Amino acid sequence: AKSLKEIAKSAAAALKEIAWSLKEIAKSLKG
Amino acid sequence: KSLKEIAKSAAAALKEIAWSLKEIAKSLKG
Amino acid sequence: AKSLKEIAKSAAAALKEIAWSLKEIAKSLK
Amino acid sequence: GEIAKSLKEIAKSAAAALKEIAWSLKEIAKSLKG
Amino acid sequence: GEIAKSLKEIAKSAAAALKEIAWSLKEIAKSLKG
Amino acid sequence: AKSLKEIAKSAAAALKEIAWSLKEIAKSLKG
């Protein structure tokens, strides 16, 4: 399946980038 | 039922969420 | 089993609202 | 994959959390508008 | 199966995280109100 | 099926980091 897989892989990856950006926001607001 | 349709819309939203948050992170680095 | 379709639909709907608000937040911060 | 009852109720609580997160983000967007 | 019992643990961790996320966003919305 | 589980695991791990970042952001915004 390109559904249970492939789409879900892109979702998971978007979440990973969400987490990276939120850490960069947290770091800036420590600043 | 399929999830494929739904999971596609979710993934697309999460990519837009990712983009906006990178823009927020960039603005707060300014 | 495939009522998870309907729950996942409501999740995806919330993610779309999240995405929209984040666009407005990014615009305000930019 | 065995939902075995639970995964539907966990997925329900996830969806419920996302609805609350959407509400709070609307409030934050409002606050930041000024 | 292994897997089923995995999604037992995983879906629970996700749900727990989303609850924390919702709560911190409430606190952030409160802080940005003033 | 097994890999849907591994994707869901990656998502869950990212959501945990998102929660941790957000607690640091909430701490920074507290005053």
Numbering used by the authors:
A (entry chain D), F (entry chain C): 4 to 34
B (entry chain A): 5 to 34
C (entry chain E): 4 to 33
D (entry chain F), E (entry chain B): 1 to 34
Task: Provide text from the study.
De novo coiled coils (CCs) are particularly appealing modules for designing self-assembling systems as they are short, mutable, and sequence-to-structure relationships governing their folding and assembly are well established. For example, CC-Tri and CC-Tet exchanged with each other, as did the higher-order CCs, CC-Pent2, CC-Hex2, and CC-Hept. These two classes—i.e., CC-Tri plus CC-Tet, and CC-Pent2, CC-Hex2 plus CC-Hept—are structurally distinct: the trimer and tetramer have consolidated hydrophobic cores, whilst the others have central channels and are α-helical barrels. Similarly, peptides with Type II interfaces where the g, a, d, and e residues all engage in helix–helix interactions—namely the pentameric, hexameric, and heptameric α-helical barrels, CC-Pent2, CC-Hex2 and CC-Hept—also exchange with each other. To address this, using the insight from the data and analysis presented here, we have tested two different strategies for increasing specificity of coiled coils: (i) alternate placement of salt bridge-promoting residues, lysine and glutamate to discriminate the tetramer from the trimer; and (ii) incorporation of hendecad repeats to separate the α-helical barrels.
For the α-helical barrels, CC-Pent2, CC-Hex2, and CC-Hept, designing orthogonal variants was more challenging. Shifting the salt-bridge interactions was not an option as these were already at b and c in all sequences. Therefore, we took a different approach of incorporating non-heptad sequence repeats into these peptide sequences. Variations of this 3-4 spacing can lead to alternative CC sequences and structures. For instance, in 11-amino acid, hendecad repeats core-forming residues are spaced 3-4-4 apart at the a, d, and h sites of a → k repeats.16,63–67 Consequently, while heptad repeats drive association of left-handed CCs, hendecads lead to right-handed quaternary structures.16,63–67 We reasoned that replacing heptad with hendecad repeats at different locations in the pentamer, hexamer, and heptamer sequences should alter the hydrophobic seams and, in turn, might confer homo-specificity in the resulting sequences. Initially, we made several variants of CC-Pent2, CC-Hex2, and CC-Hept that extended the second heptads into hendecad repeats, with the new designs denoted by the suffix “-hen2”. In these, the original a-g sequences were maintained, and the new i-k sites were all made Ala. However, the experiments with CC-Hex2 showed considerable exchange and, therefore, promiscuity between all pairings. To investigate this and test our hypothesis of altering the hydrophobic seams, we compared model and experimental structures of CC-Pent2-hen2, CC-Hex2-hen2, and CC-Hept-hen2 with Ala at the h position. However, an X-ray crystal structure of CC-Hex2-hen2 with Ala at h revealed a similar supercoiling to the parent despite the incorporation of the hendecad repeat, possibly explaining the continued promiscuity observed between the CC-Hex2 variants.
